Amino acid sequence: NLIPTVIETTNRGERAYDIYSRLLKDRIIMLGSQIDDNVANSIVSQLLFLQAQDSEKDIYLYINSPGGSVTAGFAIYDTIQHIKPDVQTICIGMAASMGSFLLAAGAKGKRFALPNAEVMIHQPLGGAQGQATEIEIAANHILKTREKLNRILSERTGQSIEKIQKDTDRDNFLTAEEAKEYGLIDEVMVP
Amino acid sequence: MNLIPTVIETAYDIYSRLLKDRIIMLGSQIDDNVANSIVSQLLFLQAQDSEKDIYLYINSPGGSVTAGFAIYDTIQHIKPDVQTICIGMAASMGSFLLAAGAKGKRFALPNAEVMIHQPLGGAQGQATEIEIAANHILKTREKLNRILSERTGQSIEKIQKDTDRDNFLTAEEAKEYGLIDEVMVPETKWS
Amino acid sequence: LIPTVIETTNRGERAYDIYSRLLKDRIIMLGSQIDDNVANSIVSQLLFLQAQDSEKDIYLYINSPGGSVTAGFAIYDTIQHIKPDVQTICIGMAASMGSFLLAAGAKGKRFALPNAEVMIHQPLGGAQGQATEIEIAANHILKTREKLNRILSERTGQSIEKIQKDTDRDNFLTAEEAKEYGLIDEVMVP
Amino acid sequence: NLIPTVIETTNRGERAYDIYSRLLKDRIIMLGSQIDDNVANSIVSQLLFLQAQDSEKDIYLYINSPGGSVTAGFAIYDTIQHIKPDVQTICIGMAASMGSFLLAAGAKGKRFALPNAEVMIHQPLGGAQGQATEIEIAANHILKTREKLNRILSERTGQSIEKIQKDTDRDNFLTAEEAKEYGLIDEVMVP
Amino acid sequence: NLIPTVIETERAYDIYSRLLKDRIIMLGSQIDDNVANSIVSQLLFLQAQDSEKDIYLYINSPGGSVTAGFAIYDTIQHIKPDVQTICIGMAASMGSFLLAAGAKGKRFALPNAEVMIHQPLGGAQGQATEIEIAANHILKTREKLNRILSERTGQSIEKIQKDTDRDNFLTAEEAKEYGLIDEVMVP
Amino acid sequence: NLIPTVIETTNRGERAYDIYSRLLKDRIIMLGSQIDDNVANSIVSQLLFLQAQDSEKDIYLYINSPGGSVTAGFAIYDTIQHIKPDVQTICIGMAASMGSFLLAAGAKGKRFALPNAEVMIHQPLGGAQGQATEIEIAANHILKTREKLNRILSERTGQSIEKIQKDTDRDNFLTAEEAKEYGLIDEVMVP
Amino acid sequence: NLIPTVIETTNRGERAYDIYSRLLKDRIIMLGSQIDDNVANSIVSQLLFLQAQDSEKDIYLYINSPGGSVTAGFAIYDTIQHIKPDVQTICIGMAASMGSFLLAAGAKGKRFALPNAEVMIHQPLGGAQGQATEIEIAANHILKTREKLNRILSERTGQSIEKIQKDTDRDNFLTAEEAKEYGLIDEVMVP
Amino acid sequence: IPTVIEYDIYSRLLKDRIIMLGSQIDDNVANSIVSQLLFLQAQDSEKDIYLYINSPGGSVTAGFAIYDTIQHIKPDVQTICIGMAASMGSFLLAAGAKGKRFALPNAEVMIHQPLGGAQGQATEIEIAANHILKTREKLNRILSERTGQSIEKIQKDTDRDNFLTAEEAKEYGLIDEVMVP
Amino acid sequence: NLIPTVIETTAYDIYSRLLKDRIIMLGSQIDDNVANSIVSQLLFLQAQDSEKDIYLYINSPGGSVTAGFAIYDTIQHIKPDVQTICIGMAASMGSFLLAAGAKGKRFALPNAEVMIHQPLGGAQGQATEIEIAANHILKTREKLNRILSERTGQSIEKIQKDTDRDNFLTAEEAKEYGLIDEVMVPETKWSHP
Amino acid sequence: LIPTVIETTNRGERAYDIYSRLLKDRIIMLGSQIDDNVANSIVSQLLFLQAQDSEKDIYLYINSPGGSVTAGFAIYDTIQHIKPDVQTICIGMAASMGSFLLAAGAKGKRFALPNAEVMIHQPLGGAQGQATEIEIAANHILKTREKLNRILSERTGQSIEKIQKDTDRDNFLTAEEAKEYGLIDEVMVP
């Protein structure tokens, strides 16, 4: 039992939705995996389609993710800012790395976490191999990527870039209350 | 009219047939994929009817704590009561979810087992990195024990002692512990 | 390759896999090892059939080498829990937890075909780690064996002491031998 | 190109069958692989379905199989004898081991092979590992299983148990004509 | 709902299935039990639809299992309709055997198609007596293939034995001359 | 991982589209992978289909790709140029190597990047093995391929061949604004 | 990865086509992979299907292929020649080895390449292992195969067999214009 | 000749008629110990030999090469269990000169039934089963002779792993004395 | 009592026999094991005689930079002149050691190859960790180039440019570059040692 | 597992492996692929033999499929540099860099046994990476080929142009063909 189906019956007969497609009808998108190009391609396409249907109505992005690719993360980030409707973000379980970046990327006032959800922030990870000059190019690129991430996190959270740099040097785990205090979300969702 | 093909396992599978009657079947380890699916089913069922009970059958060795908390928080968040029924085994995060069902509506069948223990994990790298990971797991244990204490009526101190090692409980022991409310006996089939 | 059956209804054609087609006639096919996935499916089918009709009999065919004891117990308790009588029919082999489920069918409604085999034995497992962790695991499996033997005793009429001796090692039984044992009620003659 | 689809257009629409499901509609079952518990489950289910559709019309079981599991073979064997319709057996290509046993299990007068089909008989195979007494138990079991197979073969072919024992000590390949002479089949199907 | 239409494969109406509507069977792989069972099934279905109209079997195959090939061969002989055989690309080993097995006057190859004939291949492991049984079996299987090829080509068993000792590649024209096909299909 | 479905209800039917096929209905093509022959075959086919539906309406090509095969990239490049509609290009996330080549291949005035999308340019990569003569043939071939690539990029950007050669000697990472200044795109799309 | 779908309103209801089956309605066949027996089976099937639809109208074969099996290539080659419709060939990206052979195989005056498409010609490749007499048989066969390829290529291009032999001794890469001058194609399609 | 611990330390003890078994019993180990036993007899056919045993056992045939060589030679072979003597290890410990079988106070002994495998035809499985059952009968008979226990008791006591302390091994008759410091 | 003689070990091998004549034979990659052995040989030879020349034959694709510096620093540290002779190839740290020989005593045979390029490395982990690894390899390159400048007479600027990619030099080009002092030709066999 | 030879010397019994015993008689055995390790050993043997006697001939037996060009040149240059003549004797096969070393023997003292084989071809290699890197590797291997052909031309008396043509593909020569070519001076009669 992985992904169940929901049947609706209308004057056109039966139609079948997988559970995620059923929620998409209600403008809900689930980000529930590692972020890669396939995942970003999917989320981007869902956002574009939802705007096409209605440019005024809110979209709800549920986030349970350990992060992943920074550029895939930025394809989702930029699409969210680009479209007309507000995108609410809701953290369930865990938002780490690029996942926590996307959580912070929701419409101001509309970023949430459930009470026992975990938020983790840290610096980007990568690799470099080859000649000294090639390692230099790769190091400069990851350093500039970190600067870009911190700059945006500063705008979204209200914290200084200096504070962001210090707090992301090592793995930094926050509770839902701490994430609110930090400025990564706006509210902890009460039962 | 168009009718959706029906199957036991993948189309309209046996689990989707139960979902129509507001039953969710957990029969695997808890990972992010399973949690995201269960969360989605829970949100779907609330949207269909905010008042009617939901039924969550649990046979699970447990798994990810964060994936488990995604389910846990969704259950508390939603309006309908979620009944939990242990069949076979509920271990680790599986037992945590069983204990999280609506008060008075947490059940086990007579030969089902319940296992409670401490969270497991790993760390590698620098002394400072191991420290951060140790602190994180210890805080995760404190969070789990605090909630179990609230849901069982057992003290935090007692939970800590009883979970130091693998602790197997019968259905009756689980009831006495406060993990469940009632052992469902075959004699009361017809009430 | 699981075959499809298409049925005509007054509002259109419906495709079934062969197993869902038999499910329409209240037949459940167990033809594999018992694990959490298989137990989830069998339990789901049992609950579905109870919800369709709480009075009509269910037919559970069993060809299984066994598997997880906890997964087996999920099925066992579900069978005891539901209102309908669950008939059990052994075809091929019911071994270990498979034979436990065979014996769990409704009294008078436990069958084997003439050449079907039954095997009973003690539970299998493992433990790794500290002396204390090995002790917890040994006590648990020993308690599990007592539970299995107690229920088997009640379902077969054999004493707990006899069950213990007979399950010490692999014990292969013919369909007639299983009937004599009290694991089934009748051998189904063609 | 593995498994093609056939389309039939009816008064109330269009219906699509894979080739094997199309033949099943004409009471034809294809046993075309090694016999295991999963193959047996599908064959038994098809036989049970066909009897429920019509309890008197013949069933046709085509066999191209190297054989496999004895107990899975017996699930099929016992189901065939149990149901009311006559089950015709037709060897195409090869029937070896448990496949040749099932070929001989067809309704008397209705067991066939095509002229160039190959039939092989031999003693059961297996294994045993562990303590001396465990090896003894496993040896006693396979020997008793061989006795059971030989006894039924005797009933089905008219050959003595003594002859079957000798003729199956090692791999014994038979032509369609030799299989008829042996009593494994009734007729060689001539073009 | 209508099944989706695709080139290659839910369930789907692929290009091969669309040809099967016109009584054409496409063999474009090695011959194993799965391929054979599907082809046998297609032949039985086509006979049941119409027992009079011709069937067309295109062959591009390196061969494979001899028993799987005989499952196809015997089904072709068994059914009422004529089965035309058409070699495209290559018919090797059991593939060339099936090419030769088409209806008399209705076995074809395209001009640049290749045909290869050779002896059966196999293995044996174990006791001396077990190697002997395996050896006798493969030699009998060769005898069976050569006798049938003899009837189907009009070549003597002696000549087939000699010509199949090693890998023997034939052009479409050489295959017609050999009696494996009846005609080379000219554009 | 599952791709969501969108069901479009028409007058007398229902169309169940996967999200990508739903966008294609609105003349949107999503390039969200490495470029290889299979991806090129699909993109080219989508372009041909869209031309056949309407030869005048714009097409939208979203690009999030690390590039890949040069020849496969040229199959797409030449198809874009061949067809009558304007193909707008929109970089989201990253366009690297052949991905950045296709980005620059869009209709003039209609090449775009989102604010945080990354663009990378570098020289072609390959390999050669065997005899001295064979290595010579492969070296000359890859050198001629680089000359072809640089000449086209020169035409598309307005930069000289000499400048492109220098700027592509090593991995060269560009921001969206830098990509605009370079002439690879025409505009950075602001929210 | 996933092939997009086109859905159209038809006399039998809403009909879904993969992008390639939709193009098949315009008599377009897309070769975008290595040539093996399965690819050949598919391409031959499409050619036969299109002839059955209409025996007079032209077919358009797009070629992006690194080549592959010579025998599979000849199954396609002979099918192209056998059928009544003219088959137009259009090189996009790369036509190498058997790919370039199929490109040259198109209807006289209807063989095309897009401006940046590449063509490569060389001799057949193979292998031989075993006894000296077996290596002899394999060598003779591949030499005979090369003679066959060169004779046909001579007929199709207008070049002498002697010139083909020399030009194909090693990997020989050609631009679209070079391929035209050679006689492999008739025209370069300018945008 | 150069000397190392690992002309080694074992070579030095062999001069004083000491043979060290501190590994699993396989054909290579058996060949070495047999060769050492034959060498010591050739040096002096009357003087005692000392065999130290710390072994989890191993091959039954390899163990029987050693056992039969002990019985064949003229010198008494004292056996001294250190650490653990399991399976064929405990068999060789019990095989020492009567009255000259020893264990150190914290040494362990384990007895159980032989282990094996079988794969193939029913007839082949039967031959292998009959073989291992005969092997067990041979081991149990010899163990009965060397301990004073009945064949019936040995059979019951070796059905599963049976761990013994040094004192328990003495009471069982596998050794004669537990050595005092 | 006499030590057994062999060409190569599985005993007094061929390299040990040449070591008696103060010849050290480098014919492999430079790793720590090779470096520790060569350093040990140099220290031994100095202890035998602090005056007499050492002869280091080099046929090496190079290897570990730190291992190469263990050898380099030992050469400079000891009293005797170490002659270097390139046979076959001296690449990367191999070419660095060739250049490290006693001034006036660095040779290549006529068909030997010399290759110079930049150091190679790797980094994985956090952005901060990649930065540390990059800075370390860049400083390592500066160090190598500085020493090559001093030993060849070429400017640091020239070496940087010339080592950006693989740069293959003939024996004569290596002389012209200042990596060696003389191409040892067969014609001088009898007239010169 | 090389056999040992023991000899009485001026102050005691000394053991040699078969190869170091032959080395006493100024014989070096090449019977493998050429790599840096093999070259280190061959070069070392040649330097040792020069130091033992600078005047007496050395005998190099060659059975080798070739291998590293640079490792081969280490050997080639050492031969040309040392004072004594190096005789070369081909047994079995001298292929690629092996046939180059065979041709490198003192002129008049290059031999093959009657059934020995000689093979000549162009250098083999590879390159991965950027277009610029592939160019550097291609220029390098082409320059390496020109160097080999120039020396072969000098050693054989054949033109560079003929050598280029004759080495385009694998070219197998009998012992008599290798003499005619100029790779050896004589085929040794039994």
Residue numbers in the entry:
A (entry chain G), D (entry chain D), F (entry chain A), G (entry chain B): 2 to 192
B (entry chain F): 1 to 10, 17 to 197
C (entry chain E), J (entry chain K): 3 to 192
E (entry chain C): 2 to 10, 15 to 192
H (entry chain H): 4 to 9, 18 to 192
I (entry chain L): 2 to 11, 17 to 199
From the article:
In its active tetradecameric conformation, ClpP forms the central proteolytic compartment of a larger AAA+ protease machine. Two rings of seven ClpP monomers stack and interact to form a secluded barrel‐shaped tetradecamer harbouring the 14 catalytic sites. Small entrance pores at the top and bottom of the barrel restrict access of proteins and allow isolated ClpP to degrade small peptides only. For protein degradation, Clp‐ATPases are required (in Firmicutes ClpX, ClpC, and ClpE) to unfold designated substrates and thread them through the entrance pores.
